[model samples]
Target: MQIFVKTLTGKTITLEVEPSDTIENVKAKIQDKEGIPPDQQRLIFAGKQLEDGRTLSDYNIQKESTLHLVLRLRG
Candidate 1:
């Protein structure tokens, strides 16, 4: 499946992955593709906050999807 991650700042990050990708791992991919650290990112999917440890498969999002990437500097 492929994913499109859009930041609050209007930046978009894209990637294609297997069914086993964890929400946590997606953070790594974002940081890998750009430079936002995992600790600073929170993924908003389907208008909900995604638990970092959860897998994408849990969302029934086995196709293409978009995540709203929000940032934090403290807590």
Candidate 2:
């Protein structure tokens, strides 16, 4: 399955992974690509924080679905 991940900086990244992959995995991927830490990453789906250990299917995320990621910045 593929998911469309967008960053707060207007960066869009498309990744193909198994449906079994949890949101945490995606977070790690984004962290790897963008150099952001997991604790700093926020995976929001429909304006809600995606619960950890929840797979894409568990959240009803379909193939090619788009997930908005917001990274909290510090001073």
Candidate 3:
């Protein structure tokens, strides 16, 4: 399945991964692509946090789905 990930840098990346990909894996992919750390990652889907080890189906994410991620920074 192909999923679209929008990074905090306003960059969009299209990745081909299995439906069984967990939230952690997604985060890792984003880090690999964008150099964002997991600690600074905030993945939001339907206004909720995407938990680690949760499948795409668990979040009702479909093929070719698009997800937005915001990098949290503390001042």
Best by lDDT: 1
Please write out the lDDT profile of model 1 over residues 1-57, one tens digit for every residue: 688889888987888876688888988888898888998988888899888888888
Using all chains and alpha carbons, the TM-scores for the candidates as numbered come to 0.88, 0.84, 0.81
lDDT computed for candidate 2: 0.82
Per-residue accuracy of model 2 over 1-75 as CA lDDT, tens digit each? 778988778888998877788888988888787788887888887777897699887888888888888877662
**Alpha carbon lDDT of each predicted model:** 0.84, 0.82, 0.82
Off by over 4 Å in 1: none
Between candidates 2 and 3, name the one with more favorable TM-score. Answer: 2
**Relative to the unseen true structure, what is the C-alpha lDDT of residue 19 in candidate 2, on a scale of 0 to 100?**
76
How much is 24 displaced in model 2, in angstroms? 1.0
Give stretches of model 2 more than 4 Å off. 73-75
Q: Which ten residues in a row have the lowest lDDT in candidate 3?
A: 66-75
lDDT per residue for candidate 3 within 1-75, as digits (tens), equals: 898887667888887777788888888887787788777887878778888779887998888888888888852
Error of 1 at 8 (Å): 1.1
